[PDB]
Amino acid sequence: QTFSWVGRPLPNRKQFQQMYREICMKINDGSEIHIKVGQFVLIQGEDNKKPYVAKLIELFQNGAEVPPKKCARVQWFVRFLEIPVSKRHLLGRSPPAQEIFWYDCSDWDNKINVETIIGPVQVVALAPEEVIPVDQKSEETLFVKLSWNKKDFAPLP
């Protein structure tokens, strides 16, 4: 697949970087998939595993790499099984496959190469009372109720 910027560079005073609102991912079957800042994406992992989930917070052309690269800054989410086995019990319940967690930690480098993006995903914020359908296979829509900070789960504000 190939990527191209959509629109003009956004205003800023960053040296050697150009920021954009939107990118166009042209995939193998010919489709042109538009992804905007603020949307969520699936990100390719180590090939044995489910893709990571992240919110796009910035898109930028990075000239301080050679050759230059199209990049994104993201807000990470984490899937239940991406949380260490020894800490998962702290949730106090077994979440459905569709539930993910806002990753509240600066640990994971938040800059990625756009070439690692698989595509968009819908993510919906829920109140704790709300019910996720719990027998479902499809992950077309993921849901988030809580954050995880490496220590414990906390409700989103």
UniProtKB/Swiss-Prot annotation:
Task: List each copy of the BAH domain by range.
Answer: 33-157
Q: Where in the cell is it found?
A: Nucleus
Q: Where is this site: Histone H4K20me2 binding?
A: E82
**After translation, how is this protein modified?**
Phosphorylated during mitosis.
Q: Which family does it belong to?
A: Belongs to the ORC1 family.
Entry function: Component of the origin recognition complex (ORC) that binds origins of replication. DNA-binding is ATP-dependent. The specific DNA sequences that define origins of replication have not been identified yet. ORC is required to assemble the pre-replication complex necessary to initiate DNA replication.
| Free-text note regarding domains | The BAH domain mediates binding to dimethylated histone H4 'Lys-20' (H4K20me2), which is enriched at replication origins.
Note the subunit structure.
Component of ORC, a complex composed of at least 6 subunits: ORC1, ORC2, ORC3, ORC4, ORC5 and ORC6. ORC is regulated in a cell-cycle dependent manner. It is sequentially assembled at the exit from anaphase of mitosis and disassembled as cells enter S phase. Interacts with CDC6 and KAT7/HBO1. Interacts with LRWD1 predominantly during the G1 phase and with less affinity during mitosis, when phosphorylated.
Q: What is the designated name of this protein?
A: Origin recognition complex subunit 1
Source organism of this protein record: Mus musculus
Q: Which gene encodes it?
A: Orc1
